[PDB]
Design an enzyme around this catalytic site. Structure first.
Site, PDB file in Angstrom:
ATOM      1  N   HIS A 120     -58.703  54.412  73.412  1.00 34.84           N
ATOM      2  CA  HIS A 120     -58.007  55.651  73.820  1.00 34.84           C
ATOM      3  C   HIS A 120     -57.065  55.436  75.010  1.00 34.84           C
ATOM      4  O   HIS A 120     -57.167  56.099  75.995  1.00 34.84           O
ATOM      5  CB  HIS A 120     -59.009  56.749  74.014  1.00 34.84           C
ATOM      6  CG  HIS A 120     -59.622  57.219  72.743  1.00 34.84           C
ATOM      7  ND1 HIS A 120     -60.899  56.866  72.389  1.00 34.84           N
ATOM      8  CD2 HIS A 120     -59.150  58.041  71.764  1.00 34.84           C
ATOM      9  CE1 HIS A 120     -61.202  57.482  71.253  1.00 34.84           C
ATOM     10  NE2 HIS A 120     -60.149  58.192  70.850  1.00 34.84           N
ATOM     11  N   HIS A 174     -52.474  53.717  71.971  1.00 44.21           N
ATOM     12  CA  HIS A 174     -52.888  54.753  70.994  1.00 44.21           C
ATOM     13  C   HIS A 174     -51.976  55.969  71.082  1.00 44.21           C
ATOM     14  O   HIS A 174     -51.555  56.502  70.044  1.00 44.21           O
ATOM     15  CB  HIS A 174     -54.311  55.121  71.237  1.00 44.21           C
ATOM     16  CG  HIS A 174     -54.751  56.288  70.438  1.00 44.21           C
ATOM     17  ND1 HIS A 174     -55.008  56.186  69.103  1.00 44.21           N
ATOM     18  CD2 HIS A 174     -55.148  57.517  70.822  1.00 44.21           C
ATOM     19  CE1 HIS A 174     -55.490  57.345  68.666  1.00 44.21           C
ATOM     20  NE2 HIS A 174     -55.571  58.170  69.698  1.00 44.21           N
ATOM     21  N   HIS A 227     -52.029  63.611  73.844  1.00 50.10           N
ATOM     22  CA  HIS A 227     -53.199  64.255  73.202  1.00 50.10           C
ATOM     23  C   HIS A 227     -54.489  63.640  73.723  1.00 50.10           C
ATOM     24  O   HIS A 227     -55.532  64.217  73.479  1.00 50.10           O
ATOM     25  CB  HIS A 227     -53.100  64.233  71.691  1.00 50.10           C
ATOM     26  CG  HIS A 227     -53.504  62.926  71.125  1.00 50.10           C
ATOM     27  ND1 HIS A 227     -52.677  61.840  71.161  1.00 50.10           N
ATOM     28  CD2 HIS A 227     -54.609  62.564  70.470  1.00 50.10           C
ATOM     29  CE1 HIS A 227     -53.332  60.801  70.634  1.00 50.10           C
ATOM     30  NE2 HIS A 227     -54.521  61.210  70.191  1.00 50.10           N
ATOM     31  N   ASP A 228     -54.435  62.465  74.333  1.00 48.52           N
ATOM     32  CA  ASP A 228     -55.684  61.804  74.823  1.00 48.52           C
ATOM     33  C   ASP A 228     -55.582  61.498  76.328  1.00 48.52           C
ATOM     34  O   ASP A 228     -56.269  60.584  76.839  1.00 48.52           O
ATOM     35  CB  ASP A 228     -55.921  60.539  74.008  1.00 48.52           C
ATOM     36  CG  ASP A 228     -56.812  60.733  72.799  1.00 48.52           C
ATOM     37  OD1 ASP A 228     -57.688  61.629  72.840  1.00 48.52           O
ATOM     38  OD2 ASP A 228     -56.636  59.939  71.853  1.00 48.52           O
ATOM     39  N   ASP A 281     -53.554  61.043  64.472  1.00 48.61           N
ATOM     40  CA  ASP A 281     -54.640  60.510  65.309  1.00 48.61           C
ATOM     41  C   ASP A 281     -55.411  59.410  64.581  1.00 48.61           C
ATOM     42  O   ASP A 281     -55.947  58.529  65.266  1.00 48.61           O
ATOM     43  CB  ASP A 281     -55.540  61.657  65.667  1.00 48.61           C
ATOM     44  CG  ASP A 281     -56.297  61.397  66.916  1.00 48.61           C
ATOM     45  OD1 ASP A 281     -56.048  60.366  67.573  1.00 48.61           O
ATOM     46  OD2 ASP A 281     -57.126  62.216  67.187  1.00 48.61           O
TER      47      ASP A 281
HETATM   48 MG   LIG Z   1     -58.907  62.542  71.419  1.00 52.32          MG
HETATM   49 ZN   LIG Z   2     -56.411  60.163  69.787  1.00 47.75          ZN
END
Ligand SMILES: [Mg+2]
Ligand SMILES: [Zn+2]
Ligand SMILES: Cc1ncc(C)n2nc(CCc3nc(N4CCC[C@@H]4C)nn3C)nc12
EC number: 3.1.4.17
Length: 312
Positions: free
Chosen positions: A67, A71, A105-106, A216
């Site tokens: 993560h 990514h 998003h992460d 994702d």
């Molecule tokens: Mg996530």
């Molecule tokens: Zn992700």
């Protein structure tokens, strides 16, 4: 004005769903700006603000096995490929918001699941009872947007701004895989019974949520050596979490127990059949030009079947 260009192999392959952004970290910002400029326009964002925002986003991803910043950019590229293959289905605000959502998003992921934060009793688990890391990711995105010189949305009206931050909030929350199962079932049923309607805002929300899951999970859509090596980084995180579960006096789930290393090939099959294949099947029914993601996922499932037969 200043177009970003890419060397020829990247200029051609970045258009394909299975593109791998490469091991050269210093090229990832340029790859993203290139993707914004072509999917959104050179007018969407002030370059200097966009560059400041990107570099602050990068700084707020941690050095964890999966993560991480790589990514984030990978997930944004899969979104770029979806957007570019469905030119006319998306609003100007959706084009703007979704690449940003994917990059963010992460944000500030620590390498642990919502379930570990709840068991450890991390403060984030008291602030956010469900989708714990995902509400945090959106909260970090708003923080970075409000740093001086980082408001890439400054040219939008008060209502357009609120609309884009709502597209981003929903896209980021949708990346909580616990929410995916139900979203995909509702979408499957709406598609099959013909009620699916892209003028209905709550319908678009579900479709964008599914695109988020698809982006994702896009490691399953790559060339097999990419797929297989990404899986090593995924389990490297899961197994560290399993170790931490055992430090709290709790038997981790199989996925997170490094002692079940041997069952990985069979874990991958359950994952492709229960999550990935159904994700890309529904996405392909709704957005036919995304079919290469389903075809590549199916190909990777055959490779995991070969690993179980001892042929790979
Ligand atoms: Mg996530
Ligand atoms: Zn992700
Ligand atoms: C490729 C990929 N992308 C995204 C995510 C979130 N995931 N999550 C997985 C783990 C899938 C898994 N593995 C196992 N194992 C492994 C051995 C013991 C047990 C059977 N169970 N499950 C369910 N793989 C992915």
């Amino acid at each position: 004005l200043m177009q970003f260009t890419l060397p020829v192999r990247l200029c051609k392959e970045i258009e394909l769903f299975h593109f791998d952004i490469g091991p050269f970290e210093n090229m990832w910002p340029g790859i993203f700006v290139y993707m914004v400029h072509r999917s959104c326009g050179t007018s969407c964002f002030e370059l200097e603000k966009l560059c400041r925002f990107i570099m602050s986003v990068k700084k707020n991803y941690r050095r964890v096995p999966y993560h991480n910043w790589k990514h984030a950019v990978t997930v944004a590229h899969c979104m770029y490929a979806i957007l570019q293959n469905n030119h006319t289905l998306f609003t100007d605000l959706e084009r703007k918001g979704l690449l940003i959502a994917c990059l963010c998003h992460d944000l500030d992921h620590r390498g642990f699941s919502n379930s570990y934060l709840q068991k450890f009793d991390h403060p984030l688990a008291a602030l956010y009872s469900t989708s714990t890391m995902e509400q945090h990711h959106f909260s970090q995105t708003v923080s970075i947007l409000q740093l001086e010189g980082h408001n890439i949305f400054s040219t939008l009206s008060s209502s357009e701004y609120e609309q884009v931050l709502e597209i981003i909030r929903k896209a980021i929350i949708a990346t909580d895989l616990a929410l995916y199962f139900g979203n995909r079932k509702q979408l499957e049923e709406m598609y099959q019974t013909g009620s699916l309607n892209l003028n209905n805002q709550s319908h678009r929300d579900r479709v964008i949520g599914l695109m988020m899951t698809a982006c994702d999970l896009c490691s399953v859509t790559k060339l097999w050596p990419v797929t297989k090596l990404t899986a090593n980084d995924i389990y490297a995180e899961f197994w560290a979490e399993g170790d931490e579960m055992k430090k709290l006096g709790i038997q981790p789930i199989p996925m997170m127990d490094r002692d079940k290393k041997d069952e990985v090939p069979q874990g991958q099959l359950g994952f492709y059949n229960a999550v990935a294949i159904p994700c890309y099947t529904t996405l392909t029914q709704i957005l036919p030009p995304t079919e290469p993601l389903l075809k590549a996922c199916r190909d990777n499932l055959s490779q995991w079947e070969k690993v179980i037969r001892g042929e790979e």
